[PDB]
Amino acid sequence: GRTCPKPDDLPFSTVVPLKTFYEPGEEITYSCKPGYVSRGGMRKFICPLTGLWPINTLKCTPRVCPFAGILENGAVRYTTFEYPNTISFSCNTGFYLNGADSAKCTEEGKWSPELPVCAPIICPPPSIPTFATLRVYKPSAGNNSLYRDTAVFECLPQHAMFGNDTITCTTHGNWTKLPECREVKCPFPSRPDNGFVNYPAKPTLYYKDKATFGCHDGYSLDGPEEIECTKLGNWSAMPSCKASCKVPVKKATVVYQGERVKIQEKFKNGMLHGDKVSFFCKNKEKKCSYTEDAQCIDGTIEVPKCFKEHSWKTDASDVKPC
Numbered sequence: 001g002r003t004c005p006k007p008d009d010l011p012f013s014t015v016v017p018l019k020t021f022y023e024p025g026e027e028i029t030y031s032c033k034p035g036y037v038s039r040g041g042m043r044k045f046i047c048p049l050t051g052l053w054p055i056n057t058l059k060c061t062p063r064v065c066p067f068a069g070i071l072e073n074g075a076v077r078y079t080t081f082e083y084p085n086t087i088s089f090s091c092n093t094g095f096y097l098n099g100a101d102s103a104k105c106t107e108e109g110k111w112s113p114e115l116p117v118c119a120p121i122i123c124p125p126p127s128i129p130t131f132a133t134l135r136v137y138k139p140s141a142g143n144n145s146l147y148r149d150t151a152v153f154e155c156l157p158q159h160a161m162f163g164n165d166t167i168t169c170t171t172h173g174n175w176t177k178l179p180e181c182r183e184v185k186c187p188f189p190s191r192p193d194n195g196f197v198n199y200p201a202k203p204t205l206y207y208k209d210k211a212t213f214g215c216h217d218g219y220s221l222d223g224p225e226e227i228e229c230t231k232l233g234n235w236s237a238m239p240s241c242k243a244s245c246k247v248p249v250k251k252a253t254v255v256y257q258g259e260r261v262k263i264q265e266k267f268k269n270g271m272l273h274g275d276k277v278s279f280f281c282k283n284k285e286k287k288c289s290y291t292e293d294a295q296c297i298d299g300t301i302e303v304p305k306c307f308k309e310h311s312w313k314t315d316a317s318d319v320k321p322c
């Protein structure tokens with residue numbers, strides 16, 4: 001007689017027993033694959049005398065895991081919440097992921113691992129270094145600090161901080177490197193020849209202590225009036241007193257700091273150590289005028305050879321430039 005032929009392969013299903021032909025009266029069973037379900041479940045069929053498998057209503061669809069698109073204080077990456085898909089998690093700034101960063105919809109239609117949670121990153125109160133106080137610190141969570149909170153140390157008087165005064169609460173719930181505070185001392189500074197030095201009346205001199213210098217008349221400082229004890233045990237500078245120069249000529253228009261001046265007028269009480277000036281000289285060939293420089297160095301200034309002071313003719317200073 002007739003036989004039923006090989007049964008149709010339906011999506012996400014298996015047939016048992018699967019043969020290429022069946023005698024009338026034999027049974028087959030469609031089941032959905034693991035991870036899938038159908039309206040009606042298993043369909044059984046018996047090969048009829050006609051050899052025609054009847055019509056199969058079985059539609060197998062993925063198990064759907066419970067909705068997981070919202071992570072408080074974070075983000076979920078997903079397409080669909082159905083077997084066998086994966087979803088990823090990450091947290092907003094200042095939170096850490098408390099749990100696995102991904103989960104799968106199992107053939108049983110639950111999440112594996114369990115869904116995680118975002119929690120606030122926190123550090124405990126930080127430690128004071130030795131010979132330091134805590135200027136800026138107030139807990140922002142209980143008595144703990146939140147991510148990217150800061151604390152600031154100042155050293156004790158006579159102490160230089162090596163490192164940095166500001167620590168930050170890290171992702172790892174620990175703070176950044178603490179700075180060190182050490183006592184630092186400087187020598188007494190030397191009185192300069194032709195000058196004097198003032199510093200405070202005490203036996204040892206410490207970090208951030210100041211000395212001031214001065215000069216006798218006809219002398220001026222070749223560096224700053226004020227110096228301090230640096231963190232490296234020395235001084236900012238050690239200035240000397242140097243001789244002023246007498247005006248090297250009687251009358252001359254010169255450049256001083258980009259601007260023409262009468263050297264007689266500008267330097268009536270002499271020139272200080274370092275005062276630079278430019279005299280005007282004539283190029284007799286091209287009947288035009290150039291400058292050369294001249295500096296007061298410790299009571300000496302060399303007026304250029306090319307310069308000619310005029311005791312009716314024209315001064316270099318009054319001639320067109322070259």
Ligand SMILES: *[C@@H]1O[C@H](CO)[C@@H](O[C@@H]2O[C@H](CO)[C@@H](O[C@@H]3O[C@H](CO[C@H]4O[C@H](CO)[C@@H](O)[C@H](O)[C@@H]4O[C@@H]4O[C@H](CO)[C@@H](O)[C@H](O)[C@H]4NC(C)=O)[C@@H](O)[C@H](O[C@H]4O[C@H](CO)[C@@H](O)[C@H](O)[C@@H]4O[C@@H]4O[C@H](CO)[C@@H](O[C@@H]5O[C@H](CO)[C@@H](O)[C@H](O)[C@@H]5O)[C@H](O)[C@H]4NC(C)=O)[C@@H]3O)[C@H](O)[C@H]2NC(C)=O)[C@H](O)[C@H]1NC(C)=O
Pocket residue numbers: 172174175176177
């Ligand atoms: C807050 O809490 C946090 C939580 O733990 C703390 O975070 C930790 O920070 C510490 C370091 O302070 C971490 O430990 C250390 O890890 C160092 C780096 O390891 C990487 O390199 C290793 C190379 O062997 C390798 O094993 C790792 O795989 C790792 O690599 C990387 O992978 C990532 C991806 O995941 C990539 O993105 C990276 O690019 C990749 N990097 C590399 C290099 O591959 C490690 O070096 C360090 O070791 C020192 O201390 C050990 C103490 O026991 C000691 O045993 C070690 O020998 C080493 O020391 C030194 O030895 C090394 C050589 O091994 C010397 O280096 C060289 O010198 C050569 C000259 O001959 C030269 O040729 C080379 O170029 C090189 O310069 C080095 O000089 C030696 N130093 C000294 C002083 O002797 C240590 O294992 C820890 O893992 C972190 N944990 C976390 C969770 O982050 C944090 O510290 C806390 N903060 C505070 C403020 O307390």
Ligand SMILES: *[C@@H]1O[C@H](CO)[C@@H](O[C@@H]2O[C@H](CO)[C@@H](O[C@@H]3O[C@H](CO[C@H]4O[C@H](CO)[C@@H](O)[C@H](O)[C@@H]4O[C@@H]4O[C@H](CO)[C@@H](O)[C@H](O)[C@H]4NC(C)=O)[C@@H](O)[C@H](O[C@H]4O[C@H](CO)[C@@H](O)[C@H](O)[C@@H]4O[C@@H]4O[C@H](CO)[C@@H](O[C@H]5O[C@H](CO)[C@@H](O)[C@H](O)[C@@H]5O)[C@H](O)[C@H]4NC(C)=O)[C@@H]3O)[C@H](O)[C@H]2NC(C)=O)[C@H](O)[C@H]1NC(C)=O
Pocket residue numbers: 142143
């Ligand atoms: C910043 O962060 C800091 C650091 O954390 C934080 O400072 C902490 O501040 C808290 C509170 O300010 C301190 O806490 C606890 O204080 C207890 C005193 O009081 C209680 O009584 C008053 C009465 O008016 C009541 O109002 C309180 O709510 C509280 O009592 C409660 O009692 C009811 C009863 O009806 C219970 O239902 C509640 O559970 C209970 N509530 C609480 C919160 O406890 C003080 O006695 C406690 O001391 C504990 O825990 C300490 C942990 O370090 C531990 O050192 C102590 O030794 C003690 O633990 C005792 O442990 C014994 C065993 O080891 C146990 O022995 C017996 O009991 C059982 C029987 O079943 C057996 O073990 C045994 O057989 C034996 O019989 C004791 O019972 C047990 N004692 C208690 C009382 O449970 C708490 O400290 C913190 O101490 C303090 N921490 C530090 C480090 O300073 C600060 O608040 C934060 N700042 C800010 C702004 O948030």
Ligand SMILES: *[C@@H]1O[C@H](CO)[C@@H](O[C@@H]2O[C@H](CO)[C@@H](O[C@H]3O[C@H](CO[C@H]4O[C@H](CO)[C@@H](O)[C@H](O)[C@@H]4O)[C@@H](O)[C@H](O[C@@H]4O[C@H](CO)[C@@H](O)[C@H](O)[C@@H]4O)[C@@H]3O)[C@H](O)[C@H]2NC(C)=O)[C@H](O)[C@H]1NC(C)=O
Pocket residue numbers: 230232233234235236237
């Ligand atoms: C108060 O205190 C201290 C003295 O106790 C003074 O600190 C000294 O300052 C100098 C320069 O300001 C520094 O030394 C050297 O720094 C530079 C750069 O150094 C880097 O590069 C070198 C490679 O050359 C490498 O090792 C490192 O990467 C390093 O970071 C150098 O160019 C220079 O190095 C040499 O100095 C030698 C003289 O000692 C010469 O022979 C060399 O030809 C070359 O110039 C420089 O000296 C240090 O920070 C420090 N030195 C020491 C010995 O402690 C500070 O200046 C002083 N201040 C005042 C205001 O008086």
Ligand SMILES: *[C@@H]1O[C@H](CO)[C@@H](O[C@@H]2O[C@H](CO)[C@@H](O)[C@H](O)[C@H]2NC(C)=O)[C@H](O)[C@H]1NC(C)=O
Pocket residue numbers: 164165166
């Ligand atoms: C101590 O070190 C910190 C960390 O490097 C410095 O902070 C940085 O400051 C600069 C300019 O102020 C910024 O561009 C950076 O973004 C800061 N980094 C961080 C992690 O905050 C700080 O300036 C240093 N303190 C001193 C006194 O030098």
